[PDB]
Amino acid sequence: SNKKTKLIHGGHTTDDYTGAVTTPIYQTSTYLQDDIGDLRQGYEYSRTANPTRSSVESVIATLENGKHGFAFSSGVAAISAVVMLLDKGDHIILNSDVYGGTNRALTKVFTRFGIEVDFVDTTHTDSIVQAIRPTTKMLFIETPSNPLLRVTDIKKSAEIAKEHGLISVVDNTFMTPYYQNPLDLGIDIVLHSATKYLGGHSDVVAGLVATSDDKLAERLAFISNSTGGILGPQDSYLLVRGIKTLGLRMEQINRSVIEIIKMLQAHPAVQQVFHPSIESHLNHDVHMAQADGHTGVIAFEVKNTESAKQLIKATSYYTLAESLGAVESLISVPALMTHASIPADIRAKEGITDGLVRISVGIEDTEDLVDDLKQALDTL
Amino acid sequence: SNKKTKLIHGGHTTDDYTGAVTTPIYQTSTYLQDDIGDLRQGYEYSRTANPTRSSVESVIATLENGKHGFAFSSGVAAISAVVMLLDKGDHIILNSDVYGGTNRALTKVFTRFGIEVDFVDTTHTDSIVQAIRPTTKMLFIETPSNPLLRVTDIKKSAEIAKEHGLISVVDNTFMTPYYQNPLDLGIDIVLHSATKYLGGHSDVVAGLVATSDDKLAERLAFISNSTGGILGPQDSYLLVRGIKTLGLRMEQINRSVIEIIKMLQAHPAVQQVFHPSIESHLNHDVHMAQADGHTGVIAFEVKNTESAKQLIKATSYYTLAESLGAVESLISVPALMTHASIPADIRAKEGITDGLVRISVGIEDTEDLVDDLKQALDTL
Amino acid sequence: SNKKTKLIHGGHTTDDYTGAVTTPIYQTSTYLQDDIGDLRQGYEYSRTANPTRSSVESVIATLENGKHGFAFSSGVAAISAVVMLLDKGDHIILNSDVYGGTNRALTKVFTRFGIEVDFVDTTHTDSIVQAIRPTTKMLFIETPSNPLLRVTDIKKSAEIAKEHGLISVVDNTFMTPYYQNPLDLGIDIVLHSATKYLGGHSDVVAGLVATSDDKLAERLAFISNSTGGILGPQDSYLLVRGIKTLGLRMEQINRSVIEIIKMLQAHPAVQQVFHPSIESHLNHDVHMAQADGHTGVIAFEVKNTESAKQLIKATSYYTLAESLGAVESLISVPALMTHASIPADIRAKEGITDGLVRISVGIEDTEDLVDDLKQALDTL
Amino acid sequence: SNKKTKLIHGGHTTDDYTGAVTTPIYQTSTYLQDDIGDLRQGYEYSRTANPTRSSVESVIATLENGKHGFAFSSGVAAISAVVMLLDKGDHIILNSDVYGGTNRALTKVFTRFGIEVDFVDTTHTDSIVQAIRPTTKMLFIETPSNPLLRVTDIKKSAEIAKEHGLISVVDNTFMTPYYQNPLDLGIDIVLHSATKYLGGHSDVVAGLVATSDDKLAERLAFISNSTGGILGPQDSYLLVRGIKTLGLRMEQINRSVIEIIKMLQAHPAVQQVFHPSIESHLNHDVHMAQADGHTGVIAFEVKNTESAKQLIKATSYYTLAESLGAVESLISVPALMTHASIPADIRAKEGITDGLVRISVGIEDTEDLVDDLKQALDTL
Ligand SMILES: O=C(O)CNC(=O)Cn1ccc2ccc(Br)cc21
Ligand SMILES: O=C(O)CNC(=O)Cn1ccc2ccc(Br)cc21
Ligand SMILES: O=C(O)CNC(=O)Cn1ccc2ccc(Br)cc21
Ligand SMILES: O=C(O)CNC(=O)Cn1ccc2ccc(Br)cc21
Ligand code: NA
Ligand code: NA
Ligand code: NA
Ligand code: NA
Ligand code: NA
Ligand code: NA
Ligand code: NA
Ligand code: NA
């Protein structure tokens, strides 16, 4: 019924045979056949299907109200599988500030295979309509985006995509199925870096894909079986396990996010704050209309590089590392860590200033995270 | 020094920090940075590099006398990564009876990205020379091949590839680094389905790639990081562990292979036997010149489908399942299990008769495997 | 600082060497020595010490404000290790309704080794004073107890134990270190079945022991190394991982517990309810004084066996299985599952009626758990 | 039929449900019940029984020709469980040079519980007959023993034990079920540190017990369930996996053992060599009559401590670490590492000289191990 209950009881995460209340880990590559072609339970080769992976696939399908789930060895493997629904000569529209790994896969791997790519600012959906070519076959959006949390209208993107015969795809990593369900809004395919919130514990690299479309699912299965970027059984198990606490973790993260944003907006050493909960944020109304909560990623400006480094050194509970969606609160400086290859002037123009800090809020005590960040800001 | 010693002491499979005599399992996605950019031990994100995966990568690099190792989520993910060294418009020569999954990846995924593919019978290397187009960039060979164990001259293929500016690739799955080292013979890239002999225990799906070429390695690393078909840490650990007994397993398998072949050639219910150890096998001399032993895969003809099914039912120690390189001896009928989509007449023309049986010899007692197969054949 | 923060940042759960933000899994039995006796990082044999186990041991030591942690293969192995601090001829006082496995270990294993056992109702601590013999060496209490949740004054028990030279032990399983810290109240040794709340996900069987006493710790280490009931590295890792969400899980469980108890007290088909939050519960004041929250175990009476079985069948979100502290809400009937060997009349006298139901509240949605249990009760 | 076949096909190591050719890893603590008491497949709580552990238990039962198998968290936990078949006042006869951990468990833990212990030199079985008291209930022998490889007549010990009403126990760690089957010779209980040869890869700490006696098995099950030193599922899986190559590993180890002993007997820097294959070794005939091969543990004398340390430093392929039965060849100096607490004069009297070296032969190349040890000895 309700979400926290569905997290526990939705999908197949028990063993029908023994009754084990957790999914067994099928550390196996192949399966006995009783007669040639006769498969006891539908399994014949683990690359094609593995029962632990099938369990996590059913979880993501259930959580996104889809029919089909697919587990990949990483988020970018999920993205690559989805892009491989296209042919040489096909064209993709992506939101212009799409994830660096996504940008790099598309512009440096798949353009060598004749996939044409255009980045457009989808915060105004009519941009999509302008960018559509006769060869356009896919519309790929993250919302909210990294690191400035730009919001894109999911329902309108789905309508545009249906009208123009496009496969619509949403990278729902930042929101998780707990707050935002793109398939409910008309999108064809939803994907996740389960490396982030879903696994939740910084100990799995994994991607998950869900869809309700039987032909898209058949094609995704074929691509998974042929290019073989499958998630292994141990990681599938740890994914199923981490997802159990998704709702509790996201809700704690959200309480902390609200309070941290109040602090940041009040602090003199902080200039701009980027997060879809702020009412002056572009498409705040759209986000509230398509999501029931918030990502834990917040970005904000301090003065310069020296202040950002000082902030990192002075916090006790914000940890300097890559990635997001940990139980630990994570801190980073995009201009130095994710966007350093970009010329300084283009970083400035895009808003990636030297003192732009990104925090990923964890599940520590709210008052501790607020006070720690505030005292560190006070050292500026 | 000697191979069985190198299997134990080659590569990095201990923990420098604690002294643990086995590789720790780094079930982790991200790593603390002491200062922005400062990585304690070179790790920053597990998709990019993980220390357990790095350990198995160093093992395969060492075993193939290469400089660089790469671990993928499956053999076909390794193959796909290697194929992605090419661009739209490039052309690949493969041996004509290449592995079904390889055939399907190339002809159904990568041809949609403009990769051009030609299958040629490489048992005569001048066929390669005839097939070379101005657009040809890669030469990809398995030797021996599945299911008829056709042998291709590795050294001559490497020379042809160097002369014509081609990346040469060998799928060394069937022989393993224990018996055949293509990089020693001039090949650019060697790959494996570690799902088979290397893991050895039917409990890992994995691919491994090794090369000595720094620029090819840099490109492979970039492809791995961008398309993300990485092997996870638990599977990397089980791979390192299974490789320890590779030499013992392969040698037992070889003793059994020799004796089983004597039996099969003597038996009246068996027609043709396919294996590179038989002196009348095409390129027997070539195989002996480029390998120090034999694959455990043998194929042989019985009369028809009914005799093949009876053979399977009557053996006590040959197990009906997909895959090869298990500790168990495996048995299959290609015409029904791997080549059933092919019209009957083309199967006959290629030698995939209804009574063509493939066995993958395991590590059971030699006399037991010989006697069991013989008594089952006697029931025909 | 605050508890939810300490759960994340307390103890050693990262890799100092690589910076991995999670504890590496040292699936290893032995360690290189650089010179005879020279241990790189203090490890020499995994039974004696393993770095993943050491990590979980430091977590439990930190969470209980102790100095020393010990991880065992199960809760009853932890209990057995602690009991083995005694000699033949020594005497133990336990609370009279102690856990069945504990009762059985003491009365059927350790009495054969000359350990003398007396069960006393410790809800009045002067009972302890009466039961003390010249040979008494240990006082062992659970609070609250199973299945009727009897509360024992921890601080007074510790004082009595100090005055009389007794080792005091608390089985803190039901409360967890998140709500109750017996070492802070003078107790010598605190233990847990980490199989329940601490692991939290029904996928580890494990025991944990913490103490601040250096000589007790030395003796426990000696017993662990000699009788060898050690927790393995994979289970230690899953324990560390499950503990991260302990606070979030316990707080959700507590919100649901409060609401479920309101429902149960109002319902006509329910007679008595047993839980330390009810103000008429014996030693309610004591529990509130020594704990900051509540166990998720509740017991309550329906009419008879048929009503209890009907309750189980009619609930959608209460699962029939053994154990407690899952993410799933669990339901059981003690008179049939844990106390069936006891004669019916003695069960009645102890309050284990045929319609005594025990629920272990999970982390499902509060309103769903309340409504589901209520509609099931309405079917009576 | 034959041993190498039985290693592969004996016991239950597949999944009946899916057909998985390896035992699934049941990382689980509890099991759904369909009705109260109704267990789908006989499982209800993982401490009591776990299906992965049950799989490894069936393997050890099969390999020792017993009926019942038990997996413990370590070898010393197996030993402790077996000793707990006794009561206060009972008496045990052990062989006088029994394993240090065994000696310490008995003389420092179980004597505090009133178990009486006598060490006797069982190389003459009439010593047992002299040592038997009216209170003696158990006879516990290792053969061959550590570090001097003393051999005890198993069949005669079993007869003596039957005549006098004693439970007979053999620690069969050094020989493995591959070469020596004490239950076939009348012994009641056989146990192993599976930490050594059976796991075989230095990555599991585990104990295994097998018996054919239904009442002894019932008592062992009760002790396991009450004191809880159970092996976890991941370690049970790695045990099942390592056992597959037991025969191949032991046979390689034996070839190397024969050749190394020839070298050692010929070398001038080596005095005495201890191994049951040497024909002048005490009870050589007995060992050959009760075993089909040899342990990989060899001990031999060099001049002094300085020569032993030099030997260790000069070998390339002998690794200094604790434990035995690795794939690596291990080297140690008992007088410094396992027997250092013993006064020097008593070490001399027992034969534990300062230059007594113990090697545990691994699976490296035979010629490499011989040559490496010989060149190191030549540096003396
Ligand atoms: O480091 C990386 O992967 C590159 N950086 C990115 O994240 C993605 N990206 C690619 C081109 C480009 C232009 C402006 C901005 Br703003 C971002 C851009
Ligand atoms: O089932 C499969 O994947 C198809 N079969 C194969 O294995 C590969 N393959 C693809 C075309 C083709 C023609 C003749 C022969 Br012979 C084999 C061929
Ligand atoms: O099944 C079991 O293990 C036994 N039952 C228990 O839980 C523990 N126990 C042992 C004696 C005894 C008397 C009254 C009550 Br009330 C409980 C008792
Ligand atoms: O270090 C240890 O655990 C002690 N040493 C041992 O291995 C066992 N042991 C115990 C008494 C004793 C006397 C002579 C000899 Br020889 C060995 C003895
Ligand atoms: Na919604
Ligand atoms: Na739709
Ligand atoms: Na060679
Ligand atoms: Na080369
Ligand atoms: Na408190
Ligand atoms: Na104290
Ligand atoms: Na024998
Ligand atoms: Na017997």
Tab-separated table of C-alpha atoms in Angstrom, chain D residues 4-237:
chain	number	residue	atom	x	y	z
D	4	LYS	CA	38.518	-37.789	-7.705
D	5	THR	CA	35.029	-38.491	-9.077
D	6	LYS	CA	33.424	-38.616	-5.617
D	7	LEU	CA	35.005	-35.248	-4.798
D	8	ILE	CA	32.991	-33.816	-7.689
D	9	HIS	CA	29.738	-35.764	-7.524
D	10	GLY	CA	29.424	-36.807	-3.854
D	11	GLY	CA	27.222	-34.915	-1.434
D	12	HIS	CA	24.553	-32.362	-2.266
D	13	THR	CA	26.217	-29.380	-3.965
D	14	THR	CA	23.588	-28.267	-6.488
D	15	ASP	CA	20.272	-26.468	-6.189
D	16	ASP	CA	17.330	-28.830	-6.659
D	17	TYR	CA	15.022	-25.841	-7.234
D	18	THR	CA	16.754	-23.847	-10.012
D	19	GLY	CA	19.242	-26.487	-11.122
D	20	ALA	CA	22.194	-24.220	-10.264
D	21	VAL	CA	25.305	-26.397	-10.503
D	22	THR	CA	26.764	-24.796	-7.351
D	23	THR	CA	25.299	-24.539	-3.842
D	24	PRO	CA	23.410	-21.248	-3.388
D	25	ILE	CA	24.665	-19.008	-0.597
D	26	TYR	CA	21.789	-18.621	1.888
D	27	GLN	CA	22.832	-15.369	3.530
D	28	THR	CA	19.747	-15.553	5.727
D	29	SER	CA	18.820	-16.061	9.373
D	30	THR	CA	15.181	-17.194	9.281
D	31	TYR	CA	12.546	-18.843	7.112
D	32	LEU	CA	8.877	-18.399	6.249
D	33	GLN	CA	6.492	-20.886	7.801
D	34	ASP	CA	3.326	-21.604	5.847
D	35	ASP	CA	1.537	-22.772	8.989
D	36	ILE	CA	2.835	-22.764	12.565
D	37	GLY	CA	5.348	-25.624	12.662
D	38	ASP	CA	5.096	-26.336	8.928
D	39	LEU	CA	8.579	-25.876	7.436
D	40	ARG	CA	8.766	-25.827	3.631
D	41	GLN	CA	12.119	-27.626	3.423
D	42	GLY	CA	12.983	-28.341	7.064
D	43	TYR	CA	14.584	-24.951	7.784
D	44	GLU	CA	13.395	-22.572	10.476
D	45	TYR	CA	16.419	-20.725	11.962
D	46	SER	CA	19.920	-20.522	10.506
D	47	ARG	CA	21.743	-21.276	13.788
D	48	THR	CA	19.856	-24.564	13.903
D	49	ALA	CA	20.360	-25.298	10.188
D	50	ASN	CA	21.284	-23.340	7.037
D	51	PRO	CA	21.079	-24.914	3.555
D	52	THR	CA	24.583	-23.831	2.473
D	53	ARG	CA	26.006	-25.199	5.717
D	54	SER	CA	23.905	-28.326	5.233
D	55	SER	CA	25.522	-28.735	1.834
D	56	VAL	CA	29.060	-28.629	3.221
D	57	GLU	CA	28.004	-30.947	6.081
D	58	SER	CA	26.755	-33.487	3.543
D	59	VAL	CA	30.066	-33.185	1.676
D	60	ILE	CA	32.183	-34.013	4.721
D	61	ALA	CA	29.808	-36.815	5.733
D	62	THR	CA	30.138	-38.305	2.243
D	63	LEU	CA	33.912	-37.919	2.008
D	64	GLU	CA	34.446	-39.709	5.349
D	65	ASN	CA	31.809	-42.420	4.676
D	66	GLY	CA	29.790	-41.132	7.611
D	67	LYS	CA	26.113	-40.344	8.013
D	68	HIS	CA	26.205	-36.946	9.712
D	69	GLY	CA	28.191	-33.775	9.100
D	70	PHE	CA	28.640	-30.654	11.229
D	71	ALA	CA	30.302	-27.362	10.270
D	72	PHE	CA	31.803	-25.111	12.936
D	73	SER	CA	33.297	-21.618	12.922
D	74	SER	CA	36.835	-23.071	13.354
D	75	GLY	CA	38.641	-26.311	13.999
D	76	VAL	CA	38.929	-25.554	17.702
D	77	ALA	CA	35.172	-24.947	17.826
D	78	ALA	CA	34.665	-28.429	16.344
D	79	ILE	CA	37.053	-29.855	18.946
D	80	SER	CA	35.277	-27.970	21.747
D	81	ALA	CA	31.891	-29.261	20.583
D	82	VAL	CA	33.207	-32.827	20.604
D	83	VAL	CA	34.787	-32.427	24.055
D	84	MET	CA	31.453	-31.140	25.309
D	85	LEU	CA	30.085	-34.651	24.804
D	86	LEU	CA	31.698	-35.213	28.236
D	87	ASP	CA	30.650	-34.191	31.756
D	88	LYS	CA	32.499	-32.858	34.757
D	89	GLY	CA	34.507	-35.744	36.173
D	90	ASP	CA	35.067	-37.480	32.826
D	91	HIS	CA	38.575	-38.211	31.584
D	92	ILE	CA	40.180	-37.890	28.114
D	93	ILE	CA	43.267	-39.596	26.718
D	94	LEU	CA	45.008	-37.530	24.010
D	95	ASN	CA	48.237	-38.151	22.153
D	96	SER	CA	51.006	-36.368	24.029
D	97	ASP	CA	52.141	-33.986	21.262
D	98	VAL	CA	48.581	-32.913	20.372
D	99	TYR	CA	47.996	-29.600	18.554
D	100	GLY	CA	48.805	-26.552	20.671
D	101	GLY	CA	45.330	-25.076	20.376
D	102	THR	CA	43.882	-28.466	21.334
D	103	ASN	CA	46.237	-28.770	24.308
D	104	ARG	CA	45.267	-25.244	25.411
D	105	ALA	CA	41.510	-25.740	25.035
D	106	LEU	CA	41.689	-28.915	27.124
D	107	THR	CA	44.185	-27.899	29.798
D	108	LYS	CA	43.054	-24.298	30.284
D	109	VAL	CA	39.355	-24.181	29.431
D	110	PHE	CA	37.886	-27.629	29.957
D	111	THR	CA	39.887	-28.531	33.073
D	112	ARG	CA	38.167	-25.548	34.702
D	113	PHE	CA	34.940	-27.441	33.952
D	114	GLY	CA	36.171	-30.620	35.627
D	115	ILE	CA	37.304	-32.508	32.535
D	116	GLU	CA	40.357	-34.602	33.363
D	117	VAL	CA	43.064	-34.887	30.725
D	118	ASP	CA	45.987	-37.259	30.242
D	119	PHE	CA	48.528	-37.012	27.435
D	120	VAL	CA	49.981	-40.360	26.402
D	121	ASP	CA	52.323	-41.415	23.602
D	122	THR	CA	49.899	-43.387	21.463
D	123	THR	CA	52.544	-44.604	18.980
D	124	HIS	CA	52.341	-47.692	21.230
D	125	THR	CA	48.637	-48.384	21.696
D	126	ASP	CA	49.153	-50.324	24.913
D	127	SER	CA	49.938	-46.920	26.459
D	128	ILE	CA	46.265	-46.151	25.948
D	129	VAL	CA	45.352	-49.344	27.764
D	130	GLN	CA	47.537	-48.361	30.709
D	131	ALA	CA	46.139	-44.825	30.872
D	132	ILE	CA	42.481	-45.901	30.931
D	133	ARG	CA	40.805	-44.958	34.223
D	134	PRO	CA	37.323	-45.915	35.417
D	135	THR	CA	36.317	-42.330	34.524
D	136	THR	CA	37.813	-42.331	30.994
D	137	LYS	CA	35.150	-41.600	28.350
D	138	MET	CA	37.032	-40.353	25.264
D	139	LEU	CA	40.135	-41.202	23.247
D	140	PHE	CA	41.311	-38.330	20.996
D	141	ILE	CA	44.181	-38.837	18.543
D	142	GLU	CA	45.838	-36.959	15.713
D	143	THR	CA	47.796	-38.969	13.255
D	144	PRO	CA	50.211	-37.851	11.997
D	145	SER	CA	50.878	-35.225	14.672
D	146	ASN	CA	52.431	-31.764	14.570
D	147	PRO	CA	55.354	-30.991	14.152
D	148	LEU	CA	57.158	-34.342	14.275
D	149	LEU	CA	54.536	-36.433	12.408
D	150	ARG	CA	54.113	-39.242	14.935
D	151	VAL	CA	51.828	-41.999	13.612
D	152	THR	CA	49.156	-43.732	15.704
D	153	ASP	CA	47.455	-47.014	14.786
D	154	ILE	CA	43.861	-45.948	14.122
D	155	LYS	CA	42.279	-49.402	13.888
D	156	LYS	CA	43.847	-50.620	17.149
D	157	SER	CA	42.824	-47.398	18.906
D	158	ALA	CA	39.251	-47.938	17.711
D	159	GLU	CA	39.253	-51.515	19.034
D	160	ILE	CA	40.631	-50.448	22.416
D	161	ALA	CA	38.003	-47.689	22.560
D	162	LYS	CA	35.145	-50.072	21.753
D	163	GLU	CA	36.312	-52.607	24.326
D	164	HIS	CA	36.485	-49.982	27.070
D	165	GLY	CA	33.345	-48.024	26.193
D	166	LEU	CA	35.183	-44.920	24.958
D	167	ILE	CA	34.154	-42.418	22.306
D	168	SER	CA	37.011	-42.520	19.780
D	169	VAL	CA	37.909	-39.301	17.920
D	170	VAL	CA	40.478	-38.711	15.189
D	171	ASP	CA	41.734	-35.289	14.124
D	172	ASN	CA	42.176	-36.166	10.448
D	173	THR	CA	43.306	-32.655	9.413
D	174	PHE	CA	46.789	-33.545	8.192
D	175	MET	CA	45.746	-36.465	5.963
D	176	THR	CA	42.272	-35.241	4.729
D	177	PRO	CA	39.475	-37.669	3.731
D	178	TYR	CA	41.329	-38.081	0.443
D	179	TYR	CA	43.967	-40.367	2.000
D	180	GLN	CA	42.673	-41.578	5.382
D	181	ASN	CA	39.142	-42.436	6.548
D	182	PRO	CA	39.053	-43.106	10.302
D	183	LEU	CA	35.333	-43.917	10.351
D	184	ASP	CA	36.090	-46.847	8.047
D	185	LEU	CA	38.475	-48.139	10.719
D	186	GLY	CA	35.997	-48.143	13.628
D	187	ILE	CA	36.455	-44.598	14.944
D	188	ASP	CA	33.321	-42.913	16.290
D	189	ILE	CA	34.008	-39.282	15.310
D	190	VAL	CA	36.351	-37.723	12.737
D	191	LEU	CA	37.111	-34.000	12.703
D	192	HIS	CA	39.086	-31.479	10.655
D	193	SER	CA	40.374	-27.982	10.750
D	194	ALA	CA	38.933	-27.215	7.321
D	195	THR	CA	41.057	-24.053	7.635
D	196	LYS	CA	43.890	-26.189	6.259
D	197	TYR	CA	43.738	-28.596	3.271
D	198	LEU	CA	39.980	-28.921	2.759
D	199	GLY	CA	39.304	-25.243	2.091
D	200	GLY	CA	42.778	-25.282	0.613
D	201	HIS	CA	43.118	-21.589	-0.239
D	202	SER	CA	43.944	-19.819	3.052
D	203	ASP	CA	40.676	-17.925	3.026
D	204	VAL	CA	38.351	-19.811	5.415
D	205	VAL	CA	38.590	-20.580	9.135
D	206	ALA	CA	36.309	-23.572	9.711
D	207	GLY	CA	35.929	-26.948	11.395
D	208	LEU	CA	34.147	-30.053	10.138
D	209	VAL	CA	32.941	-33.135	12.070
D	210	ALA	CA	31.566	-36.405	10.679
D	211	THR	CA	30.105	-39.490	12.364
D	212	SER	CA	27.962	-42.548	11.587
D	213	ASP	CA	26.566	-42.738	15.122
D	214	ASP	CA	22.973	-41.467	15.369
D	215	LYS	CA	23.114	-40.774	19.113
D	216	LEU	CA	26.501	-39.053	18.945
D	217	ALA	CA	25.136	-37.020	16.023
D	218	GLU	CA	22.041	-36.032	18.003
D	219	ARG	CA	24.228	-34.874	20.882
D	220	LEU	CA	26.567	-32.952	18.564
D	221	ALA	CA	23.563	-31.247	16.942
D	222	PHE	CA	22.285	-30.264	20.387
D	223	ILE	CA	25.680	-28.857	21.397
D	224	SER	CA	26.002	-26.961	18.100
D	225	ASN	CA	22.552	-25.466	18.532
D	226	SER	CA	23.147	-24.516	22.169
D	227	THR	CA	26.725	-23.159	22.133
D	228	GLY	CA	26.384	-21.825	18.577
D	229	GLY	CA	29.862	-22.159	17.040
D	230	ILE	CA	28.319	-22.566	13.559
D	231	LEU	CA	30.058	-21.913	10.247
D	232	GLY	CA	28.409	-19.132	8.223
D	233	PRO	CA	26.987	-19.611	4.730
D	234	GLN	CA	29.691	-17.718	2.779
D	235	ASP	CA	32.446	-19.772	4.433
D	236	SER	CA	30.456	-22.980	3.922
D	237	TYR	CA	30.246	-22.093	0.223
